[PDB]
Amino acid sequence: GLSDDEWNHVLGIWAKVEPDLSAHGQEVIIRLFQLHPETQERFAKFKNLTTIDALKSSEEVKKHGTTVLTALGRILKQKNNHEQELKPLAESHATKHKIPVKYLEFICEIIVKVIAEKHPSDFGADSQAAMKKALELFRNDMASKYKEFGFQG
Numbered sequence: 001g002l003s004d005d006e007w008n009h010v011l012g013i014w015a016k017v018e019p020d021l022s023a024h025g026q027e028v029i030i031r032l033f034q035l036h037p038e039t040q041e042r043f044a045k046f047k048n049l050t051t052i053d054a055l056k057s058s059e060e061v062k063k064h065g066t067t068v069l070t071a072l073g074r075i076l077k078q079k080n081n082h083e084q085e086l087k088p089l090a091e092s093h094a095t096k097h098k099i100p101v102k103y104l105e106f107i108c109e110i111i112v113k114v115i116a117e118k119h120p121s122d123f124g125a126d127s128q129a130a131m132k133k134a135l136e137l138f139r140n141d142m143a144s145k146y147k148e149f150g151f152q153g
Ligand code: HEM
Pocket: 039, 040, 042, 043, 044, 045, 067, 068, 069, 071, 072, 088, 089, 092, 093, 097, 099, 103, 104, 107, 108
């Protein structure tokens, strides 16, 4: 679990992200695919965006990216007790999309990299440590949840 000081670090940067969420989302999905091309294959709807350019141009990618971060910010806002918001995510990711935990850690690292790039003066060492720990808590709990649905991860 994180301490409240850590949580203050996390939610402080998150407040800086929200006014530009969509552009943050978009860049996370694109960087995901670029740096770990095998993840693209889990997405039937984006199967055909083979070039980088096309990805940059897709309205669907941007809206999917926004959806992703929107879910993530509700979970981070519940701090250590985020059961209820996490459950339905773990359910869809375990039974419908089937995404391994290794792919979850890949996106996590890319979220931290994107924010760091976009907030060079407010995302310092304490904050990146705290955000890394919040996302690690989210991956861990997703991984526990997954077992309740019959999925290994
Ligand atoms: C780690 C942060 C993640 C979050 C917060 C996130 C969140 C979401 C949300 C809110 C949705 C749509 C509603 C739902 O189906 O539950 C979703 C869709 C999906 N997620 Fe994720 N996701 C995460 C990571 C991943 C990863 C790493 C992958 C694949 C490598 C992935 C693949 C998908 C798929 C395939 C869909 C369906 C998209 C469609 O409608 O066609 N998710 N995700």
